């Protein structure tokens, strides 16, 4: 059922912020593995015909015998699918959400310091998120491949803090990785996800 | 109070199984970070003069203000301290526990298949363990820096499946990493920990 989406750019398009070796392994191996395991878990079930957003939104209703496989591999597919679309080689910091962030945090620089603090604080594997929670912007972090959509919050930006996302280039220096992320955020896609709510 | 232990061997001693670049970063950065944060949690407390094993065994009675910091960083300090001692450049597959494994599983290769399967199936960051429970051996995995000692089971072998442990050499290929581990297990130390029970 589910397919590995193509990247919207070359593996080396985000250099020198994200390394081309990481982009290839992250997409062609890790994300591909999530698609493979997700297809195995939903094969022959009533989940087969559902969009991955509908599955992750309604994860709490997935049968107990496949719920962990779908939480982990469905989460992995959705989160990596959003991540590729939310990166861009020629990121401009403007648009609807940048204006909303400035209004709420006072500056982009204040927003980035809170985002970096929470992203650096996530212990073990997970994600940092900008979400809309009942019309208000919030930063949250989740473990493993958990997604805030499961708790009725709409993600508009995410950031992978699994070690596979940064180890080849940055090793233990997750703060340097978070720093490099601001250079490649696709604020056009962030706006698109925000305006859809 | 707590100090970063000295490795018992050179950073390149476990080549070609575990790369020297990883051994240096793993010990000097990741383990060092857990010691720093553990010392900040416990400074001037009761816990400051206790062994890390008694702290981690009794986590359920550490007060809520520092419980998470001690779980994560206390865990990180104990788990990495045990890991360095349980690796050797002079691994020999014999002794008390190797014989017990052969008796219980039938052969070392069947034990290794079960361990490799459970270690491969730990989703996100964590550890695979050989524990003593109810007079027999059991393979268990835990998330992040959780340690079976906290649940009253004594570990005798552990294996780090945090991506920092293998990403520079193995990238996504966790099974090849698990394969390499058998070549550097300190079965002398495994016997020491087992016979102490
Ligand atoms: Mn990832
Ligand atoms: Mn480690």
Author numbering:
A (entry chain B), B (entry chain A): 2 to 198
Q: What does the publication say?
A:
SODs detoxify superoxide, a reactive oxygen radical produced by aerobic metabolism and by the mammalian immune system in response to infection. We recently established that a Mn/Fe SOD from the bacterium Staphylococcus aureus exhibits equal activity with either manganese or iron. In addition to the camSOD (SodM), S. aureus also possesses a second, manganese-dependent SOD (SodA). All members of the Mn/Fe SOD family are related in sequence, exhibit identical protein folds, and coordinate their metal ion using identical ligands, making it unclear why some enzymes absolutely require manganese for catalysis (MnSOD), while others require iron (FeSOD), and still others show metal cofactor flexibility (camSOD).
Remarkably, the chemical differences between the sidechains of these residues are minor, with Gly (MnSOD) and Leu (camSOD) at position 159, and Leu (MnSOD) and Phe (camSOD) at position 160. The MnSOD double mutant (Gly159Leu-Leu160Phe) showed a substantial difference in metal utilization from that of the wild type or the single-mutant variants. The iron-dependent activity of the MnSOD double mutant was increased >20-fold relative to wild-type MnSOD, resulting in a highly cambialistic enzyme that displayed activity with manganese and with iron that differed only ~2-fold (CR = 0.486). It’s notable that, like in wild-type camSOD, this highly cambialistic variant exhibited diminished activity with manganese, illustrating that gaining cofactor flexibility requires a compromise with catalytic efficiency. The camSOD triple mutant (Ile19Phe-Leu159Gly-Phe160Leu) had increased activity with both metals relative to the double mutant (camSOD Leu159Gly-Phe160Leu). These studies demonstrate that positions 159 and 160 are important in regulating the reactivity of the metal cofactor. Strikingly, mutations at these positions produced profound effects on metal specificity, yet did so with essentially no changes to the protein backbone structure, at least within the resolution of the crystal structures. Altogether, the spectroscopic data indicate that the two wild-type S. aureus SODs and the two double mutants differ in their manganese redox properties. The auto-oxidation data and dithionite reduction data both suggest that the two wild-type SODs have different reduction potentials. These differences are inverted in the double mutants in both assays, which correlates with the inversion of manganese-dependent activity in these variants. The double mutation in MnSOD resulted in an altered electronic structure and re-tuning of the manganese reduction potential to more closely match that of camSOD and more catalytically active with iron, whereas the camSOD mutations altered reduction potential to make it more similar to MnSOD and more catalytically active with manganese.
